[PDB]
């Protein structure tokens, strides 16, 4: 059910949830898909992650205008790397309130990202402090611990079977953990497992660089991360 819209792809995952996909291409390597989410929550829309670029992110908003035609109340971005935060300026130009882990906003300038406008903080159990995530509706934001990066966060969608691992989680047949240049090799495995335990009823696991998968994505990612120690 892939819907092509310019250079982006949208796939409906639930009556009110879509995966957005955008592409970046470099020499010597194939084009890399990056996935985020779009959620219709009643009379408003919520976005998880930008596309790689401002232009692509503006196209996400154009697709939302054409197919949903409701205001985008907020966006949450899941770590301070280009695939998740490269299009922040497009969100801000559109007047959308933006949220990220406080640590992502701390890292953003050095990483070459524009910071989100608002910082999330997290309790010791990993769940976002609700006072820092006003009006998040069905988005349930969880910091699983350091893994792909020190700041990576994850998001479940209440009322659905969906949980989003961002770049932390790879699919059940993945042959690598991707870019580990910023990774926490000691804690990756526990963080992957903590994500699974935070959303134990989610049967559809969505992630940055593979199509949606079963919970075997979580077990397989953790088993690969076991070898990093």
Give the CA radius of gyration of the chain: 16
Quick note: the x/- pattern for Zn ion over 83-102, rule CB under 5 A, is: x-------------------
Residue number with CB closer to ligand N1G (193 or 209): 209
Stretch that binds ligand N1G, among 21-29, 131-139, 197-205, 218-226 (CB under 6 A): 21-29
Site residues for Zn ion, window 207-226 (CB under 5 A)? 208
| Partner in contact with 29, chosen from ligand N1G, Zn ion, none, beta carbon below 5 to 8 Å by kind | ligand N1G
Q: What is the H or E stretch that residue 15 is in?
A: none
Site track 91-130 with ligand N1G (rule: CB under 6 A), x = hit: ----------------------------------------
C-beta closer to ligand N1G: residue 148 or 187: 148
Query: Contact 165/195 with Cβ under 8 angstroms?
Result: yes
Asked if 70 and 21 count as a contact pair (C-beta separation under 8 A), the reply is no
Find the angle CA(89)-CA(95)-CA(99) to the nearest 5 degrees: 70
Task: Indicate whether 201 belongs to the interface with ligand N1G (CB under 6 A).
Answer: no
Question: How many of the other CB atoms lie within 10 Å of CB of 136?
Answer: 20
Tell which residue, 120, 184, 148, has the closest CA to residue 34. 148
| 40 beta partners | 45
Binding site for Zn ion (CB under 5 A): 81, 83, 167, 208
């Amino acid at each position: 059910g892939d819907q092509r819209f310019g250079d982006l792809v949208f796939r409906q995952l639930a009556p009110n949830v879509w995966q957005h996909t955008s592409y970046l291409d470099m020499p010597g390597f194939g084009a890399v898909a990056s996935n985020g989410l779009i959620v219709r929550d009643g009379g408003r829309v919520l976005v998880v992650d930008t596309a790689w670029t401002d232009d692509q992110t503006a196209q996400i908003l154009n697709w939302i205008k054409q197919e949903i035609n409701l205001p985008v109340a907020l966006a949450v971005v899941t770590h301070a790397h280009q695939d998740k935060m490269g299009g922040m300026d497009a969100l801000h130009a559109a007047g959308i309130a933006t949220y990220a882990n406080a640590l992502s906003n701390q890292l953003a300038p050095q990483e070459g990202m524009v910071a989100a406008q608002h910082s999330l903080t997290f309790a010791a159990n990993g769940w976002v402090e609700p006072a820092t995530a006003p009006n998040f509706g069905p988005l349930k934001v969880f910091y699983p611990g350091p893994g792909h990066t020190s700041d990576n966060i994850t998001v479940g969608i209440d009322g659905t079977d969906i949980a989003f691992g961002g770049c932390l989680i790879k699919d059940s047949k993945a042959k690598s953990l991707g870019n580990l240049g910023d990774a926490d090799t000691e804690h990756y495995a526990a963080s992957a497992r903590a994500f699974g335990a935070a959303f134990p009823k989610a049967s559809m696991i969505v992630m940055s660089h593979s199509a949606p998968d079963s919970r075997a994505a979580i077990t397989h990612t953790a088993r690969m991360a076991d070898k990093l120690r």
